[PDB]
């Protein structure tokens, strides 16, 4: 849904999406061939589903067709120091894909902005909408517009027939954060069909026991998960499916 959005925020006002109480499957993203770039700076570009993370932040904005590789830790430049800045320690992935056919219009649409210059470099994971007038020392800028001081935000000129370097490109950067809070967004769990009346190693929601499974007459309470014996030995489980 967030990839199929109708409106995309500017780089200086990149939208952040926080995901919780949800199971995220990356198989569709991996198998989607519409992405022109899937370089990931995380621990593994395939074990993302297997890994368990507490929370995920998605940053989506539109930049030039070029400098897509420029969105990375370090890599000093205009976009790095005066636009959305990626921290030097980043464990997420960078996804880029072309969207010329829908977001590009004739006449050079100016709905997309970007920050040209500020007093200091932008800290990682920062959003700036103040758009205060930049000063160049002399500061003769008590009026709306003065010398050496103008609007720091510049409007992108995007054209479908323009060179691919100047063509609209979509980048979505996802960040994985580890905190003291318990994990709430991890990959789907694969479950096989149960087999009964056979000594089979089983993993019932982390129980990890071995034995023979057979139907039972005991009445588990609805909230209960797995029973126990006098000697605290697991002797009954409730099937989650």
């Amino acid at each position, epitope marked *: 849904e967030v990839f199929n959005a109708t409106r995309f925020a500017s780089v200086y006002a990149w939208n952040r999406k926080r995901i919780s109480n949800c199971v995220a499957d990356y198989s569709v993203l991996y198998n989607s061939a519409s992405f*022109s770039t899937f370089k990931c700076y995380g621990v593994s570009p395939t074990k993302l589903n297997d890994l368990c993370f507490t929370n995920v932040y998605a940053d989506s904005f539109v930049i*030039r*067709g*070029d*400098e*897509v*590789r*420029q969105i990375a830790p370090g890599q*000093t*430049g*205009k*976009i*790095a120091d005066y636009n959305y800045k990626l921290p030097d320690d980043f464990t997420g992935c960078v996804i880029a894909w072309n969207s010329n056919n829908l977001d590009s219009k004739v006449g050079g649409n100016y709905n997309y902005l*970007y920050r*040209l*210059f500020r007093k200091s470099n932008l800290k990682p994971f920062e959003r700036d909408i103040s758009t205060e007038i930049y000063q160049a020392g002399s500061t003769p800028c008590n009026g709306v517009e003065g010398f050496n001081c103008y609007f720091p935000l*510049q409007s992108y*000129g995007f*054209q479908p*027939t*323009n*060179g*691919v*370097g*100047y063509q609209p*490109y979509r980048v979505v950067v996802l960040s994985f954060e580890l905190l003291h809070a318990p994990a709430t967004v991890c990959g789907p769990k694969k479950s096989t069909n149960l087999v009964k009346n056979k000594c089979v190693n089983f993993n019932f929601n982390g129980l990890t026991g071995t034995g023979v499974l057979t139907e039972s007459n005991k009445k588990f309470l609805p909230f209960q998960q797995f029973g126990r014996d006098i000697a605290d030995t697991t002797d009954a489980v409730r099937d989650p499916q």
Partner: antibody
Amino acid sequence: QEQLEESGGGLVKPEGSLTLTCTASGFSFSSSYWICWVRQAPGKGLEWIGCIYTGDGSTYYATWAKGRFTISKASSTTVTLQMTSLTAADTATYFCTREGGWYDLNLWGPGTLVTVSS
Amino acid sequence: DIVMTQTPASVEAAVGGTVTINCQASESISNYLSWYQQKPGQRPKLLIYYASTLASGVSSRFKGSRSGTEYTLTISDLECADAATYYCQSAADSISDKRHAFGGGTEVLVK
């Protein structure tokens, strides 16, 4: 209006390093894919070599001169310049031209003259 | 690197006339092509935005046809000012890597 200007030494020793200054009346701070590596041979013709983006990515050199030529854009007041090494019978004239949309060169700069011989 | 060729630079006309010049490349991409005016002893000028357009401040006779893999440009009504060599520039189409291949060009001679 927007205009590109160049300045450089008239003479250089053979296989000597010479710095080519370039200034632009327009700021061109973030969206200028300008090229000053187009090599105009005297009476023969131009030959593009490399470009530069404002993002400090160094872009590409096309392996025309391999790595002996480099771009170090100082930014500031539209200050851009290039270093040359192992220059041997290189052509005198080359212009700092700005690149607009559709991968073109809208505005070129004044000619420059360099002599490889001592 | 992008390899390219072009027609011989010899162009001869007596009074005006229409002369066609073909400047093509084997791997040149579509819709990304621009020519220029190279006045001897003068600054080069742009005349076309892309794919045989007019740009701004250019005579309506500076047209062309994209056609197939070959790229042909048509120039008519040659004059003393128009008696300057023209250069065709081609560029690659890729974000990761791009390069330009300047042509040998054709020289306009007016009798």
